Design a binder for these strands. Structure first.
Ligand SMILES: Nc1nc2c(ncn2[C@@H]2O[C@H](COP(=O)(O)OP(=O)(O)OP(=O)(O)O)[C@@H](O)[C@H]2O)c(=O)[nH]1
Ligand SMILES: [Mg+2]
Ligand SMILES: [Mg+2]
Ligand SMILES: [Mg+2]
Lengths: 250, 404
RNA sequence: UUGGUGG
DNA sequence: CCCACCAAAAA
């Protein structure tokens, strides 16, 4: 039942990986048939969808920024920028020469954007994270990526013992502090804080107790994983977290 | 090192978040006692409103005898400078950043703020209108300590002001400054990657990534498209930051090992050391036990990680008195610790323990040879750097504000 | 990449 | 100088 809830949370996270979920909005969910149109203007299918996706993310983007995300599709940096001109002239999005940027035309629905805002980032686990025994897997039951942050994998010893020791600290939400910020911070964005509570409530559906997963960078600094709930990161974030195992101080 | 009650650590944490975090311990508690009865009204003018409020609610829950889950925060005062002071045995640098006690003429131990000290030292000698803001000075200090030459050149120019800046650093932290100097000349122009192992077995790999800039034309106007590629480089400015960060990384892992320990594992190791454990042995334990014991011999840093690999056969390869001494130096009751690289949070009834454990680690780094051990792997040959004051570690054990 | 978060 | 992570703009 908490195991079931945990599988549900991971199910939500896996469906809302940013870029694959955005692509769906331009493939199987668009009224527009981008496959046919991209054939028409002679633009590679996967390239065009990715450019549409990058524009729905950035909203506005200068040329070096947009070519960076797409460089891996072509043998040349130049080929990428040409394809982008071809798409801008065919009204896939606009380029305004007076500000030297691209401006989006086709953006994802608000309903899909809210799911991405809620679930694209890892959440705490509501069961004990898996014991780590190799440098793959980050504590969850369905991920087996390199545990080291960014593209820095090794199979040499990276002190799994520390991650395993941090991963089993049980934590909980202090709802008293969490309500204070929403009620009292403005006299001390609004859209952002709206999704925090939905996630925190969903998170704690089977009880106010959960665990943060931990990953090392290449140097061995240790980072707790998650955006909405994290004792690292913002001051408005730290304040809400406490130990699940309370104690009488004396 | 003076101790505090659990309730007093709550007081210090709430004062910090108002915040008076650069004030001495007793001034912070004195400020608290004065305002205890009006705390909920101070939330709107505190530097960290949310953390202040959480602390206040915890204080109230404690007064009524209710259990709490709220952890207080104790932060390293200039982590990086602290580690470099300890690595190099630099007594002058240590006094900048609470690695050892500094007393004023009154003789009170002061909570020092290195950047302010160096900012004041710089106005005192520059004199006669010195046009420099303190935070621009902190940026120059802290980026320089990690090897930046561009950012101090930007805050101080390249003339007499820069000269005064480098002279001040050379009196306030000679060995730290020389070591930062030295790291610059340690890059290998043929290397695609640097590798070194920490004494608790963590393998650090730094791949050398260099800018590749493809230029592009779009509407007959030029755009430069820069992408990071693996390569080599003639100089490198990264070793000081990466080595120092690997060491604070080490301090985090080891501090959490010594604080959040398995009470049943400790009692097994104590019996194992005294010949009273039932026979248990695994051949896979041997390699790692040997490796970690070796790092202890070369460095002075005994990791409690070694407990994971000690068995009836493997205990034979270590000195059992060193293992028992380490265990005896650990907290008598274990506790959870949350860490933000050089910030530490725990329940307030473990405040005393977490400061004792931080102090021991700084002192361990100060006493031993971790710097040589790491530099030798970085540059590819045996080197030895000496301590500038080989007794600094004795004072480190007793320092007051390493965490504040 | 412009920015912003923590250290 | 070194990391790690968000967030996505105006008639
Ligand atoms: N390399 C590098 N490290 C930084 C930088 N900013 C913070 N740090 C890290 O933070 C440590 C010191 O913490 P600070 O950011 O100076 O915090 P502080 O000294 O308590 O000062 P406050 O900002 O008032 O909290 C250094 O040793 C670094 O490891 C930076 O710009 N570059
Ligand atoms: Mg701070
Ligand atoms: Mg930036
Ligand atoms: Mg910053």
């Amino acid at each position: 039942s908490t195991i079931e809830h945990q599988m549900h949370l991971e199910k939500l996270y896996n469906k809302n990986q940013l870029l694959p979920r955005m692509r769906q909005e331009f493939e199987e969910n668009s009224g527009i048939d981008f496959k046919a149109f991209f054939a028409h203007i002679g633009i590679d299918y996967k390239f065009g969808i990715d450019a549409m996706v990058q524009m729905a993310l950035h909203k506005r983007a200068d040329l070096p920024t947009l070519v960076g995300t797409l460089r891996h599709h072509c043998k040349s940096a130049q080929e990428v920028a040409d394809n982008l001109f071809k798409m801008a002239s065919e009204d896939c999005f606009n380029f305004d020469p007076t500000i030297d940027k691209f401006i989006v035309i086709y953006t994802i629905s608000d309903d899909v954007q809210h799911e991405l805002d809620s679930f694209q980032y890892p959440l705490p686990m509501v069961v004990r994270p898996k014991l780590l025994t190799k440098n793959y897997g980050t504590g969850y039951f369905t991920c087996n990526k390199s545990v080291i942050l960014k593209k820095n994998h090794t199979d040499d010893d990276i002190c799994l013992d520390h991650l395993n020791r941090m991963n089993k600290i049980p934590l909980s939400i202090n709802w008293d502090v969490a309500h204070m910020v929403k009620n009292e911070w403005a006299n001390l964005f609004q859209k952002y804080d709206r999704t925090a509570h939905e996630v925190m409530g969903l998170l704690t559906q089977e009880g106010n107790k959960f665990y943060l997963t931990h990953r090392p960078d290449k140097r061995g600094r240790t980072y707790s994983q998650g955006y909405h709930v994290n004792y690292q990161g913002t001051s408005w974030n730290k304040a809400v977290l406490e130990f699940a195992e309370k104690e009488v101080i004396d | 090192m003076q101790t505090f009650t659990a309730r007093e650590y709550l007081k210090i944490d709430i004062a910090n978040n108002y915040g008076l975090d650069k004030e001495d311990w007793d001034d912070r508690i004195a400020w608290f006692d004065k305002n205890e009865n009006n705390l909920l009204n101070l939330v709107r003018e505190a530097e960290e409103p949310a953390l202040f409020y959480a602390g206040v609610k915890a204080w109230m829950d404690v007064k009524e005898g209710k259990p709490i889950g709220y952890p207080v925060a104790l932060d390293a005062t200039s982590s990086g400078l602290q580690i470099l002071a300890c690595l190099t045995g630099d007594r002058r640098a240590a006094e900048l950043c609470n690695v050892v006690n500094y007393r004023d003429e009154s003789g009170k131990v002061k909570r020092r703020d290195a950047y302010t000290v160096i900012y004041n030292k710089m106005l005192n000698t520059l004199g006669k209108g010195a046009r420099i803001k303190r935070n621009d000075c902190k940026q120059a200090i802290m980026t320089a300590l990690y090897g930046s030459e561009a950012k101090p050149k930007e805050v101080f120019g390249e003339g007499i002001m820069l000269n005064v800046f480098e002279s001040t650093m050379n009196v306030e932290a000679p060995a730290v400054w020389e070591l930062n100097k030295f790291w610059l000349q340690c890059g290998n122009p043929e290397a695609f990657v640097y590798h070194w192992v920490m004494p608790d077995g963590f393998n650090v790999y730094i791949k050398v990534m260099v800018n590749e800039v493809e230029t592009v034309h779009f509407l007959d106007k030029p755009y430069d498209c820069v992408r990071k590629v693996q390569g080599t480089e003639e100089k490198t400015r990264m070793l000081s930051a990466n080595t120092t960060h690997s060491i604070d990384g080490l301090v985090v892992r080891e501090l959490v090992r010594r604080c959040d320990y398995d009470k049943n594992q400790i009692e097994y190791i104590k019996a194992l050391c005294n010949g009273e454990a039932e026979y248990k042995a695994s051949e896979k334990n041997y390699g790692k036990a040997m490796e970690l014991w070796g790092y202890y011999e070369k460095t002075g840093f005994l990791t409690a990680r070694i407990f994971d690999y000690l068995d009836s056969e493997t205990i034979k390869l270590v000195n059992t008195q060193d293992i028992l001494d380490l265990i005896e130096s650990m907290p008598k009751k274990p506790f959870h610790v949350l860490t933000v690289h050089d910030c530490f949070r725990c329940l307030p009834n473990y405040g005393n323990d977490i400061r004792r454990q931080y102090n021991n680690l700084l002192a361990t780094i100060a006493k031993g040879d971790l710097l040589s051990f790491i530099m030798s792997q970085v540059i590819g040959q045996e080197v030895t750097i000496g301590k500038l004051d080989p007794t600094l570690w004795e004072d480190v054990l007793e320092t007051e504000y390493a965490l504040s």
